[PDB]
Symmetry: D2
Subunit: 726 residues, 4 copies
Amino acid sequence: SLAPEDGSHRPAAEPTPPGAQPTAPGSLKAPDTRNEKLNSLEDVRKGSENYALTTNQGVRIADDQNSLRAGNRGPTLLEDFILREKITHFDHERIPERIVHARGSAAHGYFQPYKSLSDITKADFLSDPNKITPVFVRFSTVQGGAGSADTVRDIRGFATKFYTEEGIFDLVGNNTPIFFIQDAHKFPDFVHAVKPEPHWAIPQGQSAHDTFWDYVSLQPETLHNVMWAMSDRGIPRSYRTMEGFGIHTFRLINAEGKATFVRFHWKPLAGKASLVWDEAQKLTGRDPDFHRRELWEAIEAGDFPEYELGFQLIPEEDEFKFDFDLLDPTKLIPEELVPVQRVGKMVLNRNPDNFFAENEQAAFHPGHIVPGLDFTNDPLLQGRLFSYTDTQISRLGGPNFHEIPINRPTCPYHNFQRDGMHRMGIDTNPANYEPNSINDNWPRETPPGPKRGGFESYQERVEGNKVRERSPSFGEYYSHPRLFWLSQTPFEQRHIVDGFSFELSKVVRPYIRERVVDQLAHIDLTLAQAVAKNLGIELTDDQLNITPPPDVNGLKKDPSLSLYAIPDGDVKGRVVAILLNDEVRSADLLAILKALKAKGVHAKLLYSRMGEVTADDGTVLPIAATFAGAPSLTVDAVIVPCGNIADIADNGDANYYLMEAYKHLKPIALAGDARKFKATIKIADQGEEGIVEADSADGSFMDELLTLMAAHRVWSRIPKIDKIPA
Amino acid sequence: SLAPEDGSHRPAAEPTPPGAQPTAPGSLKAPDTRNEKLNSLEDVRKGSENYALTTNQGVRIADDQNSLRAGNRGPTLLEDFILREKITHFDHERIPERIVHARGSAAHGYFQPYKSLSDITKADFLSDPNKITPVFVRFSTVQGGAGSADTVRDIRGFATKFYTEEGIFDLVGNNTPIFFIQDAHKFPDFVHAVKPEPHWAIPQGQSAHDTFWDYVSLQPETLHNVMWAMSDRGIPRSYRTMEGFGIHTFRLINAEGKATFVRFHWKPLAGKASLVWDEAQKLTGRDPDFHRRELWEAIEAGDFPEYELGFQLIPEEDEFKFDFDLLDPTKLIPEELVPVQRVGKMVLNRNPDNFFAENEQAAFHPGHIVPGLDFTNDPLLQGRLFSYTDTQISRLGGPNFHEIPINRPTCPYHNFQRDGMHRMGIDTNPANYEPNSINDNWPRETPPGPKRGGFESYQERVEGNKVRERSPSFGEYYSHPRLFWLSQTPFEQRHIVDGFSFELSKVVRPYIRERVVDQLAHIDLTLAQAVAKNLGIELTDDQLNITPPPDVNGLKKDPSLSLYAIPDGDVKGRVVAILLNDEVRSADLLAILKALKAKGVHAKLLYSRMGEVTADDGTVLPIAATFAGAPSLTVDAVIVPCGNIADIADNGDANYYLMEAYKHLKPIALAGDARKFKATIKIADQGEEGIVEADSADGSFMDELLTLMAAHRVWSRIPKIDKIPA
Amino acid sequence: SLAPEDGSHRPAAEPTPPGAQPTAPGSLKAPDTRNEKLNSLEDVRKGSENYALTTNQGVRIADDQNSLRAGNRGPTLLEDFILREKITHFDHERIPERIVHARGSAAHGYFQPYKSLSDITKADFLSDPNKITPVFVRFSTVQGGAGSADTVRDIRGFATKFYTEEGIFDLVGNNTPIFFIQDAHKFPDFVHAVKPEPHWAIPQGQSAHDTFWDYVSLQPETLHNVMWAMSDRGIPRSYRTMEGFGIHTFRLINAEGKATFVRFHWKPLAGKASLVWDEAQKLTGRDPDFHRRELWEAIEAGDFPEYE
Amino acid sequence: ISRLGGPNFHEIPINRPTCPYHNFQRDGMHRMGIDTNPANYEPNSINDNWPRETPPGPKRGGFESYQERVEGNKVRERSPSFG
Ligand code: HDD
Ligand code: HDD
Ligand code: HDD
């Protein structure tokens, strides 16, 4: 027995805040969290406790420490079948990673609609407010490999597998409402341009290189999503604090056959929140797994990520009433023109057991729709339908990928397909064809109907010649980037300018920079001049005379496009760093932890070493991490309680901890003699907005601090940070 | 509803003789035949009746007759995900075939020992006469593809998967007691030589071509198994009527650690029986699926194939007592020197449900042993141990092939292996490594012991230098071919001579034939001269003075090596053709069928067309096949009842039916005016042995016939067939 | 030296009638027969005479008869990399066979048009009577596996790969002018019906079983091709003595953008000739490789298959 | 076999030897080399046994393992000297 007698090796099977316990597989951490999909996976789950170590053939292994050899110092013998099996499996562990979105993090949950949508869709999972549909959701980046970092500047993926009673429905979206390109034929072109360059495979997880901006400068259709990626949208605080969109216009079909155009939205319950770039870039080095960890730990804490599903709904006769083409995925539908209507809510409440088996092997594909839903002629969606079935043949080893447990439907599935690599199902049907008499033609077709019917495509009208040709209605590239730009706050605009500037500064060929600046001058001259200034470029008089693009159906801004314009913050699930000293004033800490617990805010107690310290009243305080081990990048605010401040007053890591949080605009709270730290951040004796300070942490100290946290960051501090050396 | 109203599309779920019902998947034909492995497969068995036709994602299909197109005479649309999923799966149905033994047929069954064997082995499946071990057995040829024919001249494989309580044990044997080569390094060379030649991929399923006999002429070690292949052993009547051998010497390990050398035998309860060459070769054309079909139909009729397992046992101190090396797999152990001792019996009593899922995907490997068994230094076996693990990585798509359902153990298996393509099992173990504290080191090693202990290799002494070198004790090539030859009956010897003669006639390069004849002269000069005469070769004076090889430890012959020297014929399961006419004598047919049923001999009623005829007493007789439809190749004897014999007397197909069966030495019985047919086979009025004849089928008629059948063929007829034009 | 002293191991590199000589690889049997595609393959052709035996890494092997073992009656050692490379490659020799048409026989050749088809198509390989196009042609059955027999009763495939100056053009046809089914959605249903039945994988290379005729009775569209299958068209004397058809209506596009509907045909120079059924069925037993053999040997005789 | 798709990974250009390589191995996924040898086995007479084995020697000779002495029982055991 190698476990410790005190049993401290096993985490408790109950919700615990991040860092209190070792993380564990979901069925062990929360065995009583169940749904119909989790239960169906029990047949393939494998335990371990009280079992013998065997080969894959069931043979008990006596000595798992040594190869078989001719003498204890002799050659290894080919007849060691236990070695060779163990090494063979190891030698073939890896499978191809996803072509795009290879880096991702996933969890189980459930979905439930608010009310029956049977008036607009016959889709069964939206027909009754009491119908609960299990889900599996994978969040992702786009460009980086499976081993790349979480907090890069990138688009994020948001893929939801609905295990419906009438088929698997995959909603395969991103965290922005549009994509970079218009036609699927260009997808390898765009992806090759953004991916690491083919001679040397640099850089990983970054669009800040020549070939990406080269493609953008020559393809202005890309400009809208590029705007989004250069904003703080491209660097989310977590997957819980981002939006989701299906991007394409789809169709809803009701029992009477009426089609309604629809676009899908996920609204985060935790609000919209993003990092700032210096923080996001450094965090890819201090913790490349930050988003993966934060997701797992929130679920282990009970901080279940929640999202409200919503629809923008457009009648068929309104197809042409907007300036933009509904079928153009580089165009958004402003919520000011078509509101998002609440449909239901999704809760992610259990982690997987084995990342490889459940996350890496999961297969999402937007062609996986159910009766009540249908496609449109969006030329990007159209080509997606081919790719997501095709790519699985190599990634997941063949055509039986639906038999891998995480991908199996929970509803019945029967047909006349047979064979293929690693076929699990053993068909007893006398027939493998239809029409057949020898099994009385079963399984049988089902006619279309209002529920439990067969799938039939909406009989939309088609008219035109066979052409490789872009619809002229698509050939407008600058109005929607402008609408986005004007909808941002001034500090969000600053960050957009700084994103473009930082990225173009790493383009080596200067003529590429100049061509991207010229495209910006077609969007907004304020934006283009600000970027040009940082690049040492001067706009020509002709460029200064570029007429701006028209408004979007009269709109000159839409505050739903901004992260922060309308407050939607939420402190539940946020984390505060508490910086300890060797004789902490316990009255401060008790007030701090009481206020944080009331709002569901977590705390990390940090010191210069691990182990424990003792407060003034003798209370023993366990240390979560060092100052260097858990930098301010990983928390939302910093609190410094009173006590023996001289212990850390001249500690470089303690001082830098506050300087980093200050530069990154986070709230900071100083109690008693901890107010001496204002000098390291150059805060005058009069104080300033964003620095909570008082004689002690009792009173309004923590309400000021929690109000600041509900506002996410202290945007008013931005003029002051450029003098801070951090 | 497409099935007929009389319900005649569905086979009866009861035992029925061959031809009486349509064949069916095992679980529908015999739902009440069960064992633990069959039951454990119910989780992956898929039904069909009363289920909707769906996609693999569970979506119900409305129209499975048409692609989705723009207009009903327009182009097919990329958005048809139902089409593309169906075609994709079809497009990827095939997996690589087995490098060797690609043609095979398999069945489920069970094994049971006669008594406890714990004095000599601690193997759990041999420990208790009431311990029942499920099995899955695949019989195979060697050379041809999965699409090649059954009744070729080849070696047969005989692979048994024992689903043991202490792990999978695969006994992977052949139907002869030796192999062609000594060291596994030569296996690709031998196999390439016997397989179709690389320029043009000819010939399929035949050793009768230049490169095979080239290798043989240059590799005398091959001569022993070549002798078996040229004998009638190479063309068995059924998989039920052949022997089985593990070939290599293995070890039995008992609980006190004593090692006993062992070779494995399967003795067929139905006795030993083979075809003749002209019959077997023509049958590869008339029914290339004859062995597969006969196996399947015997099981559906209740004629379960049965084999007795037996051990040749040799104490460790006797390793060097014999003239041959025990570890040399081209040498057999004569039963006259070391008898085969009975161990238990194996019954094959249910067919699979899906050939591809269960047969094609099954993975046998002789390195799959269990505690109580161990290997030896046999250099052919030693290399096999590498190959059967390695080949599955491409054939079965990766290292998780044990998770394919037919291959799964029925006992526990738990280890720290993870991932790999198609990974089914979801591991909940906090640890994927040992030693580990975080799961208190589970799953754990198990010390070896008398039962339920870990595997430990027998600590055999090893002494020598690292050499690529053949043991001198292996350098003897002719003694065992001679033993075999001399142990054969005169008619068996004639068939061997004609085997060699027919094959070498197909060798294009005459010098190869000459070199093979020189090798035979080192075996036996009677054999060598007979073959040479058929090839137009004249043995030189020196070849005539080649000294024959020595006896095998004083043994000059061993009747256990003959198919027929010791009678072991059994008639149950054999088939008789009955040649009808349009007014059969019903008293004859009544007595024929009553006697055949009394011994378990099946019958098929043949005529010049399908449908029915009526007998003289009004009885309606259903026709099973036409004369050409089911040739005499496919039956064991022929009976011609009395009646309107003129109806068929001048029918060429009916006359040829008898001539073919006569040429191939099968018994023929003729009643009443049927005796008129003696003219077509040139039998004199006073009859001859092997032709049953009487005024009616009454009396000793059917007893005479069944007596001939138990003797298999009428060997005395051989001198008469050479003048028969058939 | 293991060859006979009289050199009778080696076939002559000149045309010879069937059975006169051992068959041989084409570039050894007819090295003067060349086209642009055959010549472009010289970069990957591998010799053998006067070379040492090596591993795939180029290491010369001293003893290709024995595994490395601890003593000559000892266990085989894991460090024998020469064994494991040789057995590894052997162990992975097979690739999946074609889903349909798995059984087939192929040869090289060339094509040239009689006159310029410029008026009706701008296809380059049809623009100049002096323009030679290399081809590779595979003939096949449909139902049986790669190891099934040649003279079965089946449709035959007739696939031609044209290596034109403006791209590969594959003309993938059969020996009857129609097919069994109308819509590609039904192709796995039809193929599953004609193929060996799923429970026991019987019969090989035959449509003479329940599921095939079950489908046919329920799908009258199949009857036309079934009629060709049941005729002597289904058992050709040789690949040289059958027709070929593209089946589908395609289009020809000229330089003016005018489309012409076209159906493709191959007309055998040797004429149309078929076996009879009892003959064909017995021949799948006496020589299951009859058609592959006959094509190879006709070419070695200089008796080249030709099709218009 | 899984990482590079099969046993012909030596034919991927970066992995190819620059020296001659010839043996009797054939086929496998994505086979590039087109073998003209009449024989795919040895010993063979039909190509006069080419390509042929080479005895070990001072230069350009075949590979032979150093004939080190081996002495001991078949054991799964760490040498005490490693402890
Ligand atoms: C025609 C090609 C193509 C195009 C135009 C798109 N995608 Fe895609 N996408 C793929 C081809 C693809 C893929 C290559 O098929 C992936 C990679 C691995 C996979 O299974 O699917 C994939 C993966 C993938 C994933 C990750 C799913 C997972 O977690 O496994 C997401 C979230 C998206 N895509 C979302 C989108 C969105 C929102 C698009 C624009 C509207 C989009 N893709 C356009
Ligand atoms: C070192 C290579 C090697 C050598 C020397 C042998 N075999 Fe083998 N055998 C294989 C390598 C192999 C293989 C390539 O690994 C196969 C083909 C596909 C497979 O799964 O195993 C196989 C298949 C195979 C099968 C078919 C199993 C099934 O039905 O799936 C049988 C019955 C045998 N072998 C029996 C033998 C016997 C009785 C041998 C001589 C004693 C023998 N093999 C030598
Ligand atoms: C939608 C599926 C489908 C349909 C409707 C057809 N085929 Fe096909 N065919 C295939 C799917 C396929 C395939 C599965 O893609 C094959 C098997 C493996 C391959 O490479 O192509 C093939 C092989 C194949 C070959 C073998 C090529 C070779 O020698 O390698 C020929 C000659 C044909 N087909 C001809 C036809 C003809 C004349 C058809 C009717 C007009 C036809 N096929 C319908």
